[PDB]
Amino acid sequence: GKLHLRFAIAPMRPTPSQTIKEFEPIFKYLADQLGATYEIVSPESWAAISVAMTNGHVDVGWLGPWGYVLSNKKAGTEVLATVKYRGEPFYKALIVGRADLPIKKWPEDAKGLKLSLSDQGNTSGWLIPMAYFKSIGIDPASYFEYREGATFGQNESQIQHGLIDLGSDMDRGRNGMIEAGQIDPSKSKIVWESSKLPNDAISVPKDFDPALKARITEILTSLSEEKAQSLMGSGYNGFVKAKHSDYKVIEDAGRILG
Ligand SMILES: [Mg+2]
């Protein structure tokens, strides 16, 4: 009678090893509160963690917003809580450019430039920038010299080294890379920033044990900002109780894109 939990976390940092090193402590804390043993993985892409949850491989997953919406539609995955960054359950999508890129008439002056978006399960990296371009009648695949599937770490590296012109990122991710000395911010600039988006979703499978679900929610949402920050990467400092309707803006964007 030894309780065991399978954990997964999305690409919070540029590599899976950095993500696990910095964020495992919150999962270890959660398991210890329950007297559970555990295992943990961090897939390379935002799509991959959504798929792992949908296919029955994960008990408690830290999914991105679009990854949660997709898994809920396909398998009935439930959101229990939303992560806080700087005390708020929100964040912004970015399009970043080379520092010397002419942008005074953006994006009408950008035809044929090299643009890299992320995997199709990535909210800020793919869904939101695609929705932006469609809202102004631009098809990125024909308008730009276009690539899809890159990680946020790859986008920022390639911009800094002059291999692409433009790439997607999220504000909380870019901040962490600057803070860790992984980006020289003098070599890039923010070209576009979205409106506020709901943050990542702490998620469980459909019909996960009801008693355990309630306990998990209480353990995470009762944490002080100081204690939460001591267990996670810089800026991540708590959890708030959440439900499906908190993700409406993401569901709406997905539906409009088809
Ligand atoms: Mg507590």
Numbering used by the authors: 7 to 63, 64C, 65 to 157, 158C, 159 to 242, 242A, 242B, 243 to 262
Article excerpt on this structure:
The two common oxygen atom positions between the phosphite and hypophosphite make equivalent interactions with residues in the binding pocket, namely the sidechain and mainchain amide of T129, S130, the sidechain hydroxyl of Y97 and the structural water molecule (HOH). However, the additional oxygen atom of the phosphite, to which it is equivalent, points towards the D206/R178 salt bridge to one side of the HtxB binding pocket. This phosphite-oxygen atom is 2.8 Å away from the oxygen atom of D206 and 3.2 Å away from the nitrogen atom of R178, suggesting that both residues interact with this phosphite-oxygen, albeit with a rather long hydrogen bond to the arginine. Although we could not directly observed the position of the hydrogen atoms in the structure, at pH 5 it is likely that the majority of the phosphite in solution is mono-anionic (pKa 1.3, 6.7), carrying a single proton on one of the three oxygen atoms. The 2.8 Å distance between the phosphite-oxygen and D206 implies, therefore, that the phosphite is protonated at this position and acts as a hydrogen bond donor to D206. We have shown that HtxB is capable of binding phosphite at pH 5 due to a change in the protonation state of the ligand that facilitates the formation of extra hydrogen bonds within the binding pocket of the protein, enabling the formation of a closed complex.
P. stutzeri WM88 has PtxABC, HtxBCDE and PhnCDE ABC-transporters for the acquisition of phosphite, hypophosphite and organophosphonates, respectively.
